[PDB]
Design a protein around this ligand. Structure first.
Ligand SMILES: O=P(O)(O)OC[C@H]1O[C@H](O[C@H]2O[C@H](CO)[C@@H](O)[C@H](O)[C@H]2O)[C@H](O)[C@@H](O)[C@@H]1O
Ligand SMILES: [Mg+2]
Length: 307
């Protein structure tokens, strides 16, 4: 379990920080889980909060989501300083650019047809189920199927994917909130976080929030930068160039990339899961609802206006 996010302690750290890495999951984190995937549109207050955070040059703000780049662009593309990571770190659109860096170019993607065929099979035989073919991942939804037959069908599809496909393909099979998803094995939200840390060695405050099991990759990455027993004394925390950085480059470029000394210390990392106190997680904190994640920064933002 975890203590509830100490917004007081976080507020003061936020004010003292020179460079802040702010990482937000989307679904279930910045916006509630709802019936229909395309209906998960950010509220006015939510859009305003993230905007203000991007307005600050001290902040480096990213969304890290399993969503497709199109959906993310549609609702967030209007914020010039907001970075976007789509489909579990298979794509990355920095605040500067306008196009997504394909993190999967060097990966074997021949598995997509096989997975699509399987999900089509179950979509046709599971009323209310839907399929979401994305650019580097595929999601099968059953949230609007019959409660019982949906889970049953889910277990059968899962068993088929795990028994006959996973063991021979570079994929990971994700059990999401009333969905199944298949992604490339070599990418995850954790690698994106590490890429971002490598890019910004001057970060002295990290916030990261997520509601799903896939977000635990982020929480783990935010821990394993430090030695298993915590940093000892005033030792330098050094970080090698991560896979999410090197795989995009050419071997000549990669050979030139140096190790970096990170400014961040564990006390500066606020890893927050969305869920109940009892939820077992690698995050250091929790908040019960996505709405409280937003309100935390709304209250914080208002306080910044004063002084
Ligand atoms: O990584 P995030 O930003 O959380 O999204 C990953 C996952 O999320 C979406 O599905 C979920 O949210 C919708 C909207 O509330 C629900 O209807 C689904 O039941 C949830 O599973 C995306 O649509 C998926 O493609 C993606 O895998
Ligand atoms: Mg989520």
């Amino acid at each position: 379990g975890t203590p509830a996010l100490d917004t007081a302690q976080f507020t003061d750290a936020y004010k003292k920080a020179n460079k802040r890495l702010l990482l937000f999951n989307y679904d279930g984190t910045l916006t509630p889980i709802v019936k229909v995937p395309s209906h998960a549109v950010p509220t006015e207050r939510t859009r305003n909060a993230i905007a203000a955070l991007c307005k600050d040059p001290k902040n480096v703000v990213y969304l890290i989501s399993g969503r497709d780049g199109d959906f993310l662009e549609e609702h967030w593309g209007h914020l010039d300083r907001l970075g976007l990571s789509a489909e579990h770190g298979s794509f990355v659109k920095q605040p500067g650019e306008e196009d997504f860096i394909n993190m999967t170019e060097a990966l074997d993607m021949s598995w997509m047809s096989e997975v699509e065929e399987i999900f089509k099979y179950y979509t046709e035989r599971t009323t209310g189920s839907t399929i979401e073919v994305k650019k580097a991942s595929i999601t099968w939804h059953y949230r609007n199927s019959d409660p019982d037959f949906g889970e049953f069908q889910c277990k059968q599809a899962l068993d088929l994917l795990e028994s006959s496909l996973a063991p021979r393909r570079p994929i990971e099979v994700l059990v999401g909130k009333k969905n199944l998803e298949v992604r490339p094995l070599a990418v995850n939200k954790g690698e994106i976080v590490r890429r971002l840390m490598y890019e910004n060695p001057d970060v002295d405050l990290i916030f990261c929030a997520g509601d799903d099991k896939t977000d635990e990759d982020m929480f783990r990455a935010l821990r394993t930068i430090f030695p298993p027993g915590g940093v000892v004394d005033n030792n330098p925390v050094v970080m090698k160039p991560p896979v999410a950085v090197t795989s995009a480059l050419e071997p000549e470029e990669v050979a030139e990339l140096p190790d970096v000394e990170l400014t961040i210390r564990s006390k500066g990392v606020f890893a927050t899961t969305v869920g109940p106190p009892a939820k077992r997680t690698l995050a250091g904190w929790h908040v019960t609802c996505p709405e409280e994640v937003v309100e935390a920064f709304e209250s914080l933002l208002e306080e910044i206006q004063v002084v």
